[PDB]
Amino acid sequence: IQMTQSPSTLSASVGDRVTITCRASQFISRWLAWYQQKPGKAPKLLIYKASSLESGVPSRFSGSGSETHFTLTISSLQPDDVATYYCQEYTSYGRTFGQGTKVEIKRTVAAPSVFIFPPSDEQLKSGTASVVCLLNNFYPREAKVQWKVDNALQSGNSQESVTEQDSKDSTYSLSSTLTLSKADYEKHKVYACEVTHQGLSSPVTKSFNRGE
C-alpha cells in the first residue's frame, strides 16, 4: 500500500489558499488522517475521517476526499503554519504514511545584517581555529558568502547551516564557519567574509585584523 502525496514542497505568502493532494494506491474509504509536524516537535492531528476536524484546530483547516483521492486545504495561510504535513491511512492492520509536504512563506526581502567573530583564545590553544560569519533575519534563503584570508579567496574549508524559517518575521539566518590550523591562523592577518544577497545592492564585507 502506497500513499502518494503531492506536492513535495510549496511556497505561498500569508492569506493564500493552499491545497495538498494525497493520492492512495488503493481504495481506503475515508480512513485517512492529516498530521502537522513543526521542526523539532512531534506531529499533531489536524483531520480524521477525511473531513472531520480535530479539537483546537481552526476552521481554516479542511479535508475532503473519498476512495483514492484526498485533499488537505488551508484557506488562509498564517506565518506560524510553516511545517511539514503528512497523510496516514488506517484502513487495515498497519499504518501507511505519506511522503510529506513542506510549506514556507513568501515575504518582501529583508536585508541581512552581517557580523564577524574572530576565534577565541581558548580555541587557539586547542590547535584548530574557527572563524564564523553570521547573516541575520533575511529573505530569500539564497545568500553567497566568500571567505578572504590575507586578501586571498578561500575554498573547501567552510560549511553553512541555515535556520528554519522563523514563525514570526518569516526570515532565515545563515551561519558560515571557517576552519584552519593554529599555524595557518598565525601565518595570516586579514580575515574577511564578503556576502552578497538580493536585499543588499552592493556586497557588504565585514573583517578583522588578528591582534586588534
Binding site: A42, Q88, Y90, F97, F117, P118, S130, N136
Partner: protein, 213 residues
C-alpha cells in the same frame, strides 16, 4: 501523556531497548503505535501492539527483528530493537489516537533519538563569540559533540527573545558542531549575565560560558 526513554548510541549489529510510559487509565481496548523519523526524512510506521491479546503487527522494514512487549500495571510499552542497521537511525515516537481505539486522545511522545554507528560519545567543547554601535550579536559555538541532540536557551529561559540556533553540521571528522546567536541592544554595557545554557544528554555535559568582549 506519553514519554519515551532509553535512547543513546548503539553499535551496528548490537541492540537497544526503548520504553514508552503512558499516564492515566488503561483499557483492554487500547494499544500503542511506534513511529520513527530519520534525520531529514518523513514519518514511518514501525509497528502496533494491541493489549486485547497476542496481536502485534510489524512493518516489513523491521519484521522478524523488532519485538514489542509491555507490563500492564506499569503502563509502559517496550520495543527491543536488535540487529540494528545504519538505516534505523531515527527519532522514535510512541503514539495513540482516538480514531482507531488505541487511546483516548491523539497522543505523541517527545521522541528519543537512537544513532547506529561505532562512533563514541563525546562531550561538547563550547567557545564564546565576542561581539565588539548598531544592535550587536553574540553567541556560543559548540564543537566536537557526539551524538545529537543538544539544547541551548541563554540565561536558562530568561533571555530567549529573537534567538536563532542553527541545525547541527556533521563535520567529516564525525563530530557534530553548531552555534547560537542573540541580537542584543547596541550598547548593553554591563548586562546582568550571558550564560551558555548548553546541555548534552548522551554525555552528562551540562556547561555554561561567559561572552564578554
Amino acid at each position: 501523556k506519553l514519554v519515551e526513554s532509553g535512547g543513546g548510541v548503539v553499535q551496528p549489529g548490537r541492540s537497544l531497548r526503548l520504553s514508552c510510559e503512558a499516564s492515566g487509565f488503561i483499557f483492554s481496548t487500547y494499544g500503542m503505535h511506534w513511529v520513527r523519523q530519520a534525520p531529514g526524512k518523513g514519518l514511518e510506521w514501525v509497528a502496533v501492539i494491541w493489549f486485547d491479546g497476542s496481536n502485534i503487527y510489524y512493518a516489513d522494514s523491521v519484521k522478524g527483528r523488532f519485538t514489542i512487549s509491555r507490563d500492564n500495571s506499569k503502563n509502559t510499552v517496550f520495543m527491543q530493537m536488535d540487529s540494528l542497521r545504519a538505516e534505523d537511525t531515527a527519532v522514535y515516537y510512541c503514539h495513540r489516537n482516538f480514531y482507531d481505539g488505541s487511546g483516548p486522545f491523539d497522543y505523541w511522545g517527545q521522541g528519543t533519538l537512537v544513532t547506529v554507528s561505532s562512533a563514541s560519545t563525546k562531550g561538547p567543547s563550547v567557545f564564546p563569540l565576542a561581539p565588539s554601535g548598531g544592535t550587536a550579536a553574540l553567541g556560543c559555538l559548540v564543537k566536537d559533540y557526539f551524538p545529537e541532540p543538544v539544547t541551548v536557551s541563554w540565561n536558562s529561559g530568561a533571555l530567549t527573545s529573537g534567538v536563532h540556533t542553527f541545525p547541527a553540521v556533521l563535520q567529516s571528522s564525525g563530530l557534530y558542531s553548531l552555534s547560537s546567536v542573540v541580537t542584543v541592544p547596541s550598547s548593553s554595557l554591563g548586562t546582568q549575565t550571558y550564560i551558555c545554557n548548553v546541555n548534552h544528554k548522551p554525555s552528562n555535559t551540562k556547561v555554561d560560558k561567559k561572552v564578554e568582549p
